[PDB]
Amino acid sequence: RDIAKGHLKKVTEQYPDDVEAWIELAQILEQTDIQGALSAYGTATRILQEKVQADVPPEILNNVGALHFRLGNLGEAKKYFLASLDRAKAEAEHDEHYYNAISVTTSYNLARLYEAMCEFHEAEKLYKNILREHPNYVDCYLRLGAMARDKGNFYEASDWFKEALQINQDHPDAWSLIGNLHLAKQEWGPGQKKFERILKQPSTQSDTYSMLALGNVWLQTLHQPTRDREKEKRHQDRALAIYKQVLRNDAKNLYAANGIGAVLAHKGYFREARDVFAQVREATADISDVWLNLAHIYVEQKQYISAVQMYENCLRKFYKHQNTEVVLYLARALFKCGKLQECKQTLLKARHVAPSDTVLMFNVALVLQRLATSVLKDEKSNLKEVLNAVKELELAHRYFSYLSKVGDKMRFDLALAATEARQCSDLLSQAQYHVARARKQDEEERELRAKQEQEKELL
Amino acid sequence: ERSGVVCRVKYCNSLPDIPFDPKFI
Amino acid sequence: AGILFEDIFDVKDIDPEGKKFDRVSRLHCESESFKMDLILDVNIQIYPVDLGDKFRLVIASTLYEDGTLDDGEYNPTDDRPSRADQFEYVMYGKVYRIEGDETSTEAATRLSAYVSYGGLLMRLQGDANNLHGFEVDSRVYLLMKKLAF
Amino acid sequence: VDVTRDIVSRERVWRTRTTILQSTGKNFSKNIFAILQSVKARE
Amino acid sequence: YGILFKQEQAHDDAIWSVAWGTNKKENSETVVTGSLDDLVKVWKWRDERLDLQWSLEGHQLGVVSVDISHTLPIAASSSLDAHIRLWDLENGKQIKSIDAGPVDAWTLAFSPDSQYLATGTHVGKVNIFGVESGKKEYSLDTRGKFILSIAYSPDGKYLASGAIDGIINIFDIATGKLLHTLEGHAMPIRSLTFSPDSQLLVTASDDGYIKIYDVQHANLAGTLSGHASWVLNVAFCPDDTHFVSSSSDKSVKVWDVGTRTCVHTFFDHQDQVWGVKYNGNGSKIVSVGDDQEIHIYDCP
């Protein structure tokens, strides 16, 4: 490709009646910067009009719209695809170049665009118009199940994805979609190894996608209290061998190092985890995974003032507003006045979307007590706050009773509510004591204002 | 107070989905 | 340690006011993780940058990893392992102004740390907490390096 | 049918699954396996 | 089709709902909202301008739901503090405080007769409290996971409920019995409302499709592709010609209820909008959200 670029730079300057020189320019620049292929198609579109009145073939309009599909010019790529359809339909005598396949690819990108333009009805209808004329096509049959997978992972998505595999079992795309179905419900933790080892035969080897999906389903088995039983240590060493193998054959794969940092953090090296993750961070930081893995170290080292932003930055994506798993990571070691009262606000933002979780209802209580012991022990503080503190404490104690009745827990029984409930049963007596302080302070400010008002009467 | 906030730290690792680039004929 | 600040940045403009000097240009940048604004003069002659370039900028107090707080004089002849060995552009200077959104009552939320690398000015600007490492008339190093991504 | 070989023979796949895994740049494992091996000798 | 009034910094914290009147009983000109900073501001849309009229306090936790009674100029507000406090827009005072303990307190549902108040329970049932009583009168025995939305019809003939798994429970407020159960979704239904004629029922799930079902025979009338994020709030125009849709993408699309087409979209909100509601005539469309900015959208 280097020789084609250096040859194209020689025909670009000089003008020996260049007609197809700009086509071969953009045909290399689709992998490199996506603006360069666009600049070549703009001039290649107009250079085909000076020799004769000849319409642009659909093959150039289809590809120029394909570049704009990945960009934010979705409406303009839509006009390119509509015009590519109208032009390829006009090719009634181009039976050798198969105008029909050109309209097929243009309509495929057009339904791919409509799926992305908040319009799945038109994408479904366009993708079914390819199914009705050529059921031996795979991407149009795979992209239909994805649209229904938004409404749920048990509709015609889980059925269309397996029907595509029986017609083409040597399709790594269609078979990798199968393991993605079992990722909704992780009850197939150990049992997914079989179905992930189907296309691990040497004719498909090497496949980095499957080998790393193995390491992911193997890492999910960590975070268990059975590490002293010489069970999770073998799991760390097994996944580390998987990652070392896909490292020796691919040094530039990021995901290999991704899991390596996860295991090294599970070994207790937070100080030496930053280094491993650095290489990953530098390449592309714009992966959902990194904003989290990185964020754990900062919160680990009592650095919330770099941790709180990274959580926010993940949430900048157009997918949600109030996730549970983020905010769980958010409150770790929070003790600060801006880290406690404000932490309540984010916890409430999380419970607003789904209160059925036990841990939000538990944490909201823990924080509440934190704040209350910080006004009702050493304080000797504002008057109004004392009134408010007992209100909070009542709410907390109501929750301690309500929690206890709940069957399922966070994979850890909540039987330990006794010391927190003891720690509000005594703090009610602290509220009954410190409200006397309130009154003492009350009379103090009243006598202060009067002994000041008399000085003003002297003047 | 007594102890820190409960949280299940787990260094997760995800995989991306199929790109489905538009076919450049 | 002694790492007063770090983030990745990108070049948003090379000299948008228009190139005022031949060997030096006003990089304008924003940071990737802390969302800091930055203005930074660099030796565009010995270290060229374009728009859309990414670089890891590590503002440091010292050069030596152990944080042994060197004196402030030039000595080339030195065995001790430095931070400069993993960077491309390294400069030395004074923070000559710190400025912020202080009110009469409450504290600041944002700081501008201004530093002069012997004449080559820099304003790093954003969250006060991420800038708590800086104090006026302290000495400082730049330690930037271009990301090939 | 011929509609399959009519499209799979002219199209261009610039990105696929494995493309997503490697960096766009040049990040070898000399700076990765070095620390990976250094962590094992201290243990 | 644009924006008339632009209320900058309408709260200290994010707004989670918005309530506006539709009758002439001193409700259509006043705007009642409930945000997370525990300020139930009573905005009086007087002189074509959004003015504050009352500032009510007392909620422990942020307001989750605000709505105006149809045949009455009073209002109420629920939250997660298990303390549903009734209010009055005639004096800015508190009527009562229904202690819906321990936690079982969700969005409100004024009856059109302004005599009952529905509130979700964590057990799966739909508790129907009484406006002037405060006690639990009668509760629907349809258990499950949790009620995420409850709505009353403008003439009072049906009642639906959004579960956590996309289960519409069409109740009968005239006898108190479950009649249909529409399960065309598997996404947690955020909110819903009834058509001005009680014929169509929109459902705002977390799949970005506006599946408008029917109530008379419990059937789907057509799948409308909504936004790409999750439709949070959804209201119908009083004259029954259009309907607005609040998503979680900073996007205020106004879809057509007859042709199922977006007739206009607003992008003035820097954050996600959380509440949308019409006016008495359907021209001014009020909108709130995390931007804490109350925009008044005119579509003559």
mmCIF file of N, CA, C and O in Angstrom, chain C residues 71-118:
data_model
loop_
_atom_site.group_PDB
_atom_site.id
_atom_site.type_symbol
_atom_site.label_atom_id
_atom_site.label_comp_id
_atom_site.label_asym_id
_atom_site.label_seq_id
_atom_site.Cartn_x
_atom_site.Cartn_y
_atom_site.Cartn_z
ATOM 1 N N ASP C 71 17.917 21.012 43.685
ATOM 2 C CA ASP C 71 18.236 22.331 44.082
ATOM 3 C C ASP C 71 17.671 23.409 43.191
ATOM 4 O O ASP C 71 17.015 24.355 43.639
ATOM 5 N N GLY C 72 17.708 23.282 41.857
ATOM 6 C CA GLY C 72 17.417 24.314 40.856
ATOM 7 C C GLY C 72 18.622 24.809 40.027
ATOM 8 O O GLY C 72 18.497 25.816 39.336
ATOM 9 N N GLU C 73 19.781 24.145 40.046
ATOM 10 C CA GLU C 73 20.908 24.465 39.149
ATOM 11 C C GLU C 73 21.144 23.380 38.100
ATOM 12 O O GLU C 73 20.868 22.205 38.326
ATOM 13 N N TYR C 74 21.707 23.758 36.958
ATOM 14 C CA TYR C 74 22.037 22.803 35.910
ATOM 15 C C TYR C 74 23.266 21.959 36.252
ATOM 16 O O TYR C 74 24.345 22.497 36.484
ATOM 17 N N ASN C 75 23.145 20.636 36.191
ATOM 18 C CA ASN C 75 24.155 19.656 36.209
ATOM 19 C C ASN C 75 23.901 18.552 35.222
ATOM 20 O O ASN C 75 23.042 17.709 35.509
ATOM 21 N N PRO C 76 24.569 18.484 34.080
ATOM 22 C CA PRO C 76 24.260 17.468 33.102
ATOM 23 C C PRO C 76 24.731 16.108 33.510
ATOM 24 O O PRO C 76 24.117 15.074 33.233
ATOM 25 N N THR C 77 25.840 16.050 34.164
ATOM 26 C CA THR C 77 26.546 14.918 34.626
ATOM 27 C C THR C 77 25.839 14.348 35.825
ATOM 28 O O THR C 77 26.130 14.774 36.945
ATOM 29 N N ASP C 78 24.924 13.449 35.701
ATOM 30 C CA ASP C 78 24.096 12.903 36.701
ATOM 31 C C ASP C 78 23.630 11.505 36.413
ATOM 32 O O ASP C 78 23.011 11.299 35.367
ATOM 33 N N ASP C 79 23.898 10.557 37.310
ATOM 34 C CA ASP C 79 23.524 9.169 37.079
ATOM 35 C C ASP C 79 22.074 8.900 37.449
ATOM 36 O O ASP C 79 21.481 7.943 36.939
ATOM 37 N N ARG C 80 21.498 9.726 38.315
ATOM 38 C CA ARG C 80 20.278 9.354 39.008
ATOM 39 C C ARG C 80 19.121 9.252 38.017
ATOM 40 O O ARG C 80 18.986 10.103 37.132
ATOM 41 N N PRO C 81 18.266 8.237 38.138
ATOM 42 C CA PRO C 81 17.219 8.050 37.129
ATOM 43 C C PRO C 81 16.161 9.130 37.275
ATOM 44 O O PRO C 81 15.677 9.401 38.376
ATOM 45 N N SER C 82 15.782 9.766 36.223
ATOM 46 C CA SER C 82 14.904 10.856 36.079
ATOM 47 C C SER C 82 13.586 10.471 35.471
ATOM 48 O O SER C 82 13.456 9.397 34.878
ATOM 49 N N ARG C 83 12.607 11.306 35.535
ATOM 50 C CA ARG C 83 11.391 11.309 34.827
ATOM 51 C C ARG C 83 11.500 11.728 33.391
ATOM 52 O O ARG C 83 10.596 11.464 32.592
ATOM 53 N N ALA C 84 12.530 12.389 32.988
ATOM 54 C CA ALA C 84 12.747 12.883 31.688
ATOM 55 C C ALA C 84 13.089 11.822 30.681
ATOM 56 O O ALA C 84 13.044 12.070 29.471
ATOM 57 N N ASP C 85 13.464 10.654 31.080
ATOM 58 C CA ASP C 85 13.867 9.571 30.274
ATOM 59 C C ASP C 85 12.744 8.889 29.542
ATOM 60 O O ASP C 85 12.983 8.152 28.580
ATOM 61 N N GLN C 86 11.522 9.050 29.937
ATOM 62 C CA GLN C 86 10.313 8.600 29.359
ATOM 63 C C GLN C 86 9.436 9.684 28.784
ATOM 64 O O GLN C 86 8.230 9.486 28.616
ATOM 65 N N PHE C 87 9.929 10.842 28.508
ATOM 66 C CA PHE C 87 9.308 11.961 27.923
ATOM 67 C C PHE C 87 10.080 12.522 26.760
ATOM 68 O O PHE C 87 11.254 12.190 26.582
ATOM 69 N N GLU C 88 9.523 13.380 25.975
ATOM 70 C CA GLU C 88 10.034 13.992 24.812
ATOM 71 C C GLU C 88 10.328 15.460 24.904
ATOM 72 O O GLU C 88 11.256 15.965 24.271
ATOM 73 N N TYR C 89 9.579 16.205 25.646
ATOM 74 C CA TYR C 89 9.610 17.596 25.900
ATOM 75 C C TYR C 89 9.631 17.869 27.377
ATOM 76 O O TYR C 89 8.595 17.665 28.018
ATOM 77 N N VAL C 90 10.716 18.435 27.876
ATOM 78 C CA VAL C 90 10.868 18.689 29.297
ATOM 79 C C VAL C 90 11.357 20.104 29.481
ATOM 80 O O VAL C 90 12.308 20.520 28.830
ATOM 81 N N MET C 91 10.728 20.834 30.385
ATOM 82 C CA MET C 91 10.968 22.248 30.630
ATOM 83 C C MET C 91 10.997 22.517 32.116
ATOM 84 O O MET C 91 10.440 21.723 32.863
ATOM 85 N N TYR C 92 11.588 23.630 32.531
ATOM 86 C CA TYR C 92 11.699 24.027 33.929
ATOM 87 C C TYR C 92 11.288 25.476 34.119
ATOM 88 O O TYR C 92 11.563 26.313 33.268
ATOM 89 N N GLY C 93 10.571 25.792 35.184
ATOM 90 C CA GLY C 93 9.935 27.093 35.313
ATOM 91 C C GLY C 93 9.403 27.378 36.700
ATOM 92 O O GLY C 93 9.539 26.575 37.617
ATOM 93 N N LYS C 94 8.780 28.537 36.854
ATOM 94 C CA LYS C 94 8.162 28.987 38.096
ATOM 95 C C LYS C 94 6.668 29.132 37.900
ATOM 96 O O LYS C 94 6.265 29.765 36.931
ATOM 97 N N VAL C 95 5.836 28.650 38.816
ATOM 98 C CA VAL C 95 4.442 29.104 38.889
ATOM 99 C C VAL C 95 4.408 30.527 39.424
ATOM 100 O O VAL C 95 4.756 30.768 40.568
ATOM 101 N N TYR C 96 4.053 31.492 38.589
ATOM 102 C CA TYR C 96 4.162 32.913 38.908
ATOM 103 C C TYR C 96 2.832 33.561 39.260
ATOM 104 O O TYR C 96 2.812 34.648 39.824
ATOM 105 N N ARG C 97 1.711 32.913 38.963
ATOM 106 C CA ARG C 97 0.397 33.354 39.419
ATOM 107 C C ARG C 97 -0.480 32.147 39.650
ATOM 108 O O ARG C 97 -0.428 31.193 38.884
ATOM 109 N N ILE C 98 -1.315 32.196 40.668
ATOM 110 C CA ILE C 98 -2.442 31.289 40.826
ATOM 111 C C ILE C 98 -3.656 32.172 41.007
ATOM 112 O O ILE C 98 -3.621 33.155 41.736
ATOM 113 N N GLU C 99 -4.724 31.843 40.318
ATOM 114 C CA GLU C 99 -5.912 32.668 40.236
ATOM 115 C C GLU C 99 -7.130 31.764 40.244
ATOM 116 O O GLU C 99 -7.064 30.635 39.770
ATOM 117 N N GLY C 100 -8.248 32.226 40.777
ATOM 118 C CA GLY C 100 -9.406 31.375 40.954
ATOM 119 C C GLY C 100 -10.708 32.113 41.121
ATOM 120 O O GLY C 100 -10.761 33.337 41.231
ATOM 121 N N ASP C 101 -11.798 31.339 41.127
ATOM 122 C CA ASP C 101 -13.186 31.794 41.304
ATOM 123 C C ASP C 101 -13.577 31.977 42.784
ATOM 124 O O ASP C 101 -14.690 31.651 43.192
ATOM 125 N N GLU C 102 -12.684 32.508 43.612
ATOM 126 C CA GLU C 102 -13.014 32.801 45.005
ATOM 127 C C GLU C 102 -14.079 33.884 45.091
ATOM 128 O O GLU C 102 -13.994 34.898 44.399
ATOM 129 N N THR C 103 -15.033 33.728 46.003
ATOM 130 C CA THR C 103 -15.942 34.699 46.466
ATOM 131 C C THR C 103 -15.550 35.245 47.813
ATOM 132 O O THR C 103 -14.574 34.791 48.417
ATOM 133 N N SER C 104 -16.270 36.169 48.356
ATOM 134 C CA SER C 104 -16.023 36.812 49.585
ATOM 135 C C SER C 104 -16.189 35.898 50.766
ATOM 136 O O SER C 104 -15.589 36.109 51.824
ATOM 137 N N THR C 105 -17.005 34.898 50.679
ATOM 138 C CA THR C 105 -17.453 34.004 51.676
ATOM 139 C C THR C 105 -16.938 32.595 51.545
ATOM 140 O O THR C 105 -16.237 32.067 52.412
ATOM 141 N N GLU C 106 -17.246 31.922 50.491
ATOM 142 C CA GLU C 106 -16.943 30.588 50.141
ATOM 143 C C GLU C 106 -15.672 30.485 49.338
ATOM 144 O O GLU C 106 -15.154 31.491 48.849
ATOM 145 N N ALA C 107 -15.146 29.325 49.139
ATOM 146 C CA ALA C 107 -13.914 28.986 48.548
ATOM 147 C C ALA C 107 -14.041 28.968 47.045
ATOM 148 O O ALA C 107 -15.086 29.330 46.500
ATOM 149 N N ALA C 108 -12.944 28.634 46.354
ATOM 150 C CA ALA C 108 -12.882 28.434 44.907
ATOM 151 C C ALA C 108 -13.201 26.992 44.493
ATOM 152 O O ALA C 108 -12.883 26.034 45.199
ATOM 153 N N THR C 109 -13.781 26.830 43.310
ATOM 154 C CA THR C 109 -14.020 25.554 42.638
ATOM 155 C C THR C 109 -13.049 25.327 41.482
ATOM 156 O O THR C 109 -12.771 24.181 41.142
ATOM 157 N N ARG C 110 -12.511 26.392 40.880
ATOM 158 C CA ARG C 110 -11.598 26.338 39.741
ATOM 159 C C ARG C 110 -10.383 27.227 39.943
ATOM 160 O O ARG C 110 -10.504 28.366 40.377
ATOM 161 N N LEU C 111 -9.223 26.719 39.553
ATOM 162 C CA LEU C 111 -7.955 27.433 39.567
ATOM 163 C C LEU C 111 -7.379 27.527 38.165
ATOM 164 O O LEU C 111 -7.512 26.612 37.363
ATOM 165 N N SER C 112 -6.695 28.628 37.897
ATOM 166 C CA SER C 112 -5.727 28.760 36.822
ATOM 167 C C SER C 112 -4.349 28.813 37.457
ATOM 168 O O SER C 112 -4.023 29.774 38.148
ATOM 169 N N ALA C 113 -3.533 27.802 37.225
ATOM 170 C CA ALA C 113 -2.125 27.845 37.560
ATOM 171 C C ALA C 113 -1.394 28.417 36.355
ATOM 172 O O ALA C 113 -1.469 27.853 35.264
ATOM 173 N N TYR C 114 -0.696 29.533 36.532
ATOM 174 C CA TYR C 114 0.133 30.122 35.482
ATOM 175 C C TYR C 114 1.606 29.877 35.770
ATOM 176 O O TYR C 114 2.084 30.227 36.848
ATOM 177 N N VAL C 115 2.367 29.324 34.833
ATOM 178 C CA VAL C 115 3.801 29.089 35.035
ATOM 179 C C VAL C 115 4.601 29.602 33.866
ATOM 180 O O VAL C 115 4.112 29.618 32.748
ATOM 181 N N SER C 116 5.815 30.073 34.107
ATOM 182 C CA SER C 116 6.698 30.546 33.059
ATOM 183 C C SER C 116 7.887 29.629 32.979
ATOM 184 O O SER C 116 8.677 29.548 33.914
ATOM 185 N N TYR C 117 8.047 28.963 31.852
ATOM 186 C CA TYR C 117 9.240 28.198 31.565
ATOM 187 C C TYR C 117 10.260 29.134 30.933
ATOM 188 O O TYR C 117 10.402 29.211 29.716
ATOM 189 N N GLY C 118 10.877 29.969 31.761
ATOM 190 C CA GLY C 118 11.887 30.941 31.347
ATOM 191 C C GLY C 118 11.435 31.982 30.330
ATOM 192 O O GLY C 118 12.286 32.605 29.716
#
